[PDB]
Amino acid sequence: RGAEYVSAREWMRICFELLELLKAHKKAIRRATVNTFGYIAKAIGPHDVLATLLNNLKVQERQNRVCTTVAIAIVAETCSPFTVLPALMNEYRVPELNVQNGVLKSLSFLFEYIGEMGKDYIYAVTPLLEDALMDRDLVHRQTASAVVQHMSLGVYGFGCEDSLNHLLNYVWPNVFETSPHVIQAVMGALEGLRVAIGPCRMLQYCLQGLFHPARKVRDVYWKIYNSIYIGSQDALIAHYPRIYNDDKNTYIRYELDYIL
Amino acid sequence: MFLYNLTLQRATGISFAIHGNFSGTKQQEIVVSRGKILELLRPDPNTGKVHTLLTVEVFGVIRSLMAFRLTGGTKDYIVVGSDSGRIVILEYQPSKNMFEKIHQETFGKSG
Amino acid sequence: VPVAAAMCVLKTGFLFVASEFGNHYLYQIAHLGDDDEEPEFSSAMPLEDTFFFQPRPLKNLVLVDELDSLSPILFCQIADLANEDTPQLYVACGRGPRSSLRVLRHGLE
Amino acid sequence: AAFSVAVCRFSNTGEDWYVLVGVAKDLILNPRSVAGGFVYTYKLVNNGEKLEFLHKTPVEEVPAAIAPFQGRVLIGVGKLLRVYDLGKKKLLRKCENKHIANYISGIQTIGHRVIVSDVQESFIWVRYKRNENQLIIFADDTYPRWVTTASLLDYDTVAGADKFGNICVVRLPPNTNDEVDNGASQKAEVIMNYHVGETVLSLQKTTLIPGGSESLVYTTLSGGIGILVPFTSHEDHDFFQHVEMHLRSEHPPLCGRDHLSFRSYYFPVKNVIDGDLCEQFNSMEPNKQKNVSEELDRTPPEVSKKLEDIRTRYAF
Amino acid sequence: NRFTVAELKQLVARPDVVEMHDVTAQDPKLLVHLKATRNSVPVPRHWCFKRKYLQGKRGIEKPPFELPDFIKRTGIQEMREALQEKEEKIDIDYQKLHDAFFKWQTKPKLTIHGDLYYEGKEFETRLKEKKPGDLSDELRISLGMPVPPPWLIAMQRYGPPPSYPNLKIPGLNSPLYGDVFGT
Amino acid sequence: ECLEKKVDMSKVNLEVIKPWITKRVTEILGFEDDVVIEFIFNQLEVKNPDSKMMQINLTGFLNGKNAREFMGELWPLLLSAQENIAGIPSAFLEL
Amino acid sequence: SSESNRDRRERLRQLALETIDINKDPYFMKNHLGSYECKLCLTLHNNEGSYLAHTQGKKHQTNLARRAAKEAKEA
Amino acid sequence: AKHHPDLIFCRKQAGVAIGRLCEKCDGKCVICDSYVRPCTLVRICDECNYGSYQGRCVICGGPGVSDAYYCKECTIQEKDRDGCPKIVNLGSSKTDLFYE
Amino acid sequence: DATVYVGGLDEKVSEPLLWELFLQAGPVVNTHMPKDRVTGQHQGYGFVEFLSEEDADYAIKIMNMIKLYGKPIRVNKA
Amino acid sequence: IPNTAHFANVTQIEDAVSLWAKLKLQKASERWQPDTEEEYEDSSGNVVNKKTYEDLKRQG
Amino acid sequence: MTDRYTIHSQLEHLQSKYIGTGHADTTKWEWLVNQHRDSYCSYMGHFDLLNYFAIAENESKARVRFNLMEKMLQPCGPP
Amino acid sequence: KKQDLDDEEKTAKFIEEQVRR
RNA sequence: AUGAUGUCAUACUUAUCCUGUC
Q1: G19 touches strand M (CB under 7 A)
Q2: For residues D115 and D109, is the Cβ–Cβ distance under 8 A?
Q3: Where are the beta strands (DSSP E) in chain H?
Q4: Which top CATH class is F1-94?
Q5: How many domains does chain H have?
Q6: Cβ–Cβ contacts within 10 Å for residue D198, how many?
Q7: How far is it, in rounded angstroms, from Cα E100 to Cα E74?
Q8: Nucleic acid strand M within 7 Å of H78 CB
Q9: Assign residue E177 a region: left if phi > 0, alpha if psi is -120 to 50, beta otherwise?
Q10: Which domain holds residue K68?
Q11: How are strands ordered across the β-sheet holding I30-32?
Q12: Which candidate in F50, F51, F59, F73 is best for mutational testing of the K interface (most K CBs within 10 A)?
């Protein structure tokens, strides 16, 4: 509310004290913490405080770690991320892996909170997702995929679909795995990509997998094809290809071939 | 090449047409259903001419148009079935020359 | 009557004929349709053979008005074929016998 | 049953305009496969007052495309694009092309190239070699569309209608080589796509009023007339986009559908602004209009004047 | 109960897409029709592999991050490197970052809808087919000729190449501007 | 099997089928219980009963070998009662 | 707590780097996320103790005799 | 969700009972399980809200205080037009924590 | 003749300017230009497999006309 | 028998001949098999092929 | 009449309840019939598509609607 | 906007002139 | 030289969760 009465020095000290409050075993503590951290982020401005967030290498997996990530998100909102991104994207360079997947999460929550404004930054994040989605280790593919999801819901309808198709290329091989978190992640991914790209392109990736001899491929591509099928079942009609008619059955729908 | 689409002449073909006391008075209105626009017509009983009272674009393909009224009521409602996954109940407000949506409940997906 | 997609019978002798193609019509319920020599095939009337109804002109309704609008999506040529400077929209619209060559000019009658 | 008609002159003949009309024999729907076709020729005597039947050249497929191209006539019968010349007994086919996918539905011929529109496939750009009389397709599209009508906007940009109620505009890349010899190598990118919601069958880019600007006037099968006008200023386009984004949140459609979902029915929207949704600012609530004008940092009469200025510049 | 691959290839109109694992399916005709579509994409190459598409890049050491020009032209990377060297602040500008994010925005190189990610996808930098009569800049530099490339002087004597018979190269039977000396 | 023909309990009596079902239950289960008689009463209460559901309910209660014979004996008596114009089985005409 | 653990992890990484420099291990390679990777064993190492324990199981040094015989035909 | 992958939703018929959220689960989404962009309110089933089952949280199942809402990312993905997502089952969560 | 041996090159040359370079004459179907691992640099000699032999004999005739980095390029049959 | 992308998994030589026959440049080779512009008819009978019109132009 | 086939349940899993989703073991004829039924339902639902289909043919709208409703069960012959 | 607006006015001028013709 | 099952540590994710009771 007031926030002017106190000099900035006091504030930044408050920051360096707030940093370790994320060991809390309680969720509401972290809640208020992050929201405050956003408020003081407004009271000061982005660069310093987001740097102080990036000081954490996410070594403590207990209590709240990703929480710092959330702070990176909300901080990126409180003043325009239109400022902040280059610092982060640079900080993916660091060879330490867990903070790499950390900044991936930061992009995820980032797009989740920004929504429409991602109509620009999509491009900036696109090649990095390429590097991340190309797999060093599974968590990269997972988290990056989540990023593709929230980006994909956020940008909808604004005409950026092309680069999302490009990213869908690199998304597509990850379809196969038994790890629950990566498979459900990929599911959310391809669902958001469904709504953003439109079903036609999806289905054009999902055709051949339906009838493939193996059981695995059929299990999965049928799971996908179901996910594509339930929603937008109304709009699928046009995109079912032409399938020739056999002896006992007529597989051509001739209604579409009536010409005036 | 950023373009801007504009409509010069509205669609005159009617896909559905209902009749009843939509205005809440003794005069009966003609709720016509065009392709991508809703139209409310009011025929003159003396002049023998039908005048367009209201014309609003629904921005969608309306596939069903029916009217209903409760027991003891004096005005007919307007049930509009479109390509969206929600059912919309409209009540033309004469004191404003606009169709006021009474209720709108979602039932499925669009298309 | 022409091929109408919807019909609305209103009070005080009014019949709205919304045509599926071409201009629409609004015939007002003039006669009741009964008290005439027209043969009224009853449901009890047996036949083994269908009551060949004669094509008699609508002598029960009177077109009070007509909403002949668009429903074609056919062809249109916008050019200044006349002597005026503003180009006219020569659009052929209709369906079968109700087809017409309508030259659309932005103005007022 | 006639399906195509064209009136032009021949290079072998003088200044006599001939009216060639292609017809079909024994046709109906998809169950009844087309039998044969014919192409009748007219003389257009008495300065276009009377037509005299000169010759009727038959064809194996039903002709659905007739267009003049450099003194000759391009005849598209089914999936065979043939260049026929004027003959004393019948139309002598000087060239032929069988690279069509299903059937040639429309043909728009540029001064140098030829653009044929398929039935279920999108239109492709084809170059006709005058030295060897061989038509070569040098460009194609990546997305199939049931095209019904098309119009050449420029030498490399072509806008075509869709049977599903949409409108698309494809522009060729500047690095495309016309001199050449999944399907094609060079692809054409779609620069504009918009679902109009009505079946469009006639497109024409011309001036509706003298002194104004030319716009993409389009017709509809439901008896509607629309017009597409390009934005002259990037700031005005951004203002119209912000006004549309404010109107999509302040005035929803009465049918419960989304405006972006209605505009993205068949193809996603790319550089398209619906002026009909912007026209509801004068019909909406005054408090909501004042809130939208405060979000746009203007006045509601200023927004009304800015909306009426584009209509006065581009329409009657 | 299962047809052979030759009988499945002779019956299919497009036999250039049939594989050896498609005979073990429950309906090879529908799989052959769906695999020969216009805008269809094939399945990944990890259907028969045992490396789970992520264990093949063990010893391959790559760079940390390749930043774009729009981020490198803002000076944030050098300031971040100076801060990391001091730890092991800047406040350069606020409108220059907005200008690099809006006005100086570079469109990245996207991919096609059928351009799926391969296994390696880094050692096969294939690009069309730079043929006879068309060369790259630098190799011009090694060649060192000012604006024919000089072994098309010997394409005079010894004759037109067997490998590309359709050939035309400038000045001989092909009557040339910039780089491209033959078509 | 014998449980594929559609039947209807509305065209047949119910009081004449209680002694044959009681004898079949006493032959199958050995003694007389109250759950099997209630299940037989509930299986014939509907106007359009289900032979497969009654066969499953009899195989769950009994062993299955005697339950299949009980279902085959109850389907034929019901078929003979529904085929007759009176609505009674063949064992009721003699006595 | 957390800072003491970060300092202990840095001291352990420094001790592992000193042990790899003293023993002169040519197969130890660093990853881009703070981990080790064995070049000769062609496997991953989760911690610094994992790469420091790859000397009894999967001895890739004994499999280099074929490459030494291919490089030099004499003993 | 996140907090629980073995939990199953009710997915029953949508009624007129507006859903509510507990004080411990306030602001959290039902499908997307996020904290930002609320666009559509949560509607509960008729059997899921009757007598002592009314006024309870959908996700937490405790005493509901404020009304629950769905995320805008789940609304645009058509994940909010499904059945009533009432938490019926409760497995591998708050079971061994009662013993300690 | 399908293959040729190519001597006297500079490591800034790689398999690509050979690809491009000899397909200027006629297409190199199989390219081989060793990468030395130890010092990570090229000695500069090449082996080329073609479609058939005619390509490569014309290649013997024309082929010794490529000068890589101001310097001479050996091409002979193999 | 020249190999191809569809004939990679062929083992028997009997199927390879049919594969090379069906692969045989699909089914086209017809750019100018009718263009002749016969002026001898000048009524309703302009029927001739490419080689027939070439022989008619070379003869007269 | 031992059938030994009680498709009841297992562990509250799967139990398909939707129509037109399909499975991994779905046949080609069943998927083609489901696609034809979905196309018939989309033709019956869309008013502009039904108008464009009835304007080409010489039949009326209600007759074409009754023909499309009658051809839904056995519109292509179950495989 | 303003600078464009100045131009916009000119833009209007052309259309108005057109009407006159 | 991958892969296989196998007893056994080690990191990582799930914004997992600490006042629950008749």
Answers
A1: no
A2: yes
A3: 14-18, 20-22, 38-41, 43-45, 64-67, 69-71
A4: mainly alpha
A5: 1
A6: 26
A7: 7
A8: no
A9: beta
A10: 15-79
A11: I30-32, I46-49, I4-6, I76-77
A12: F59
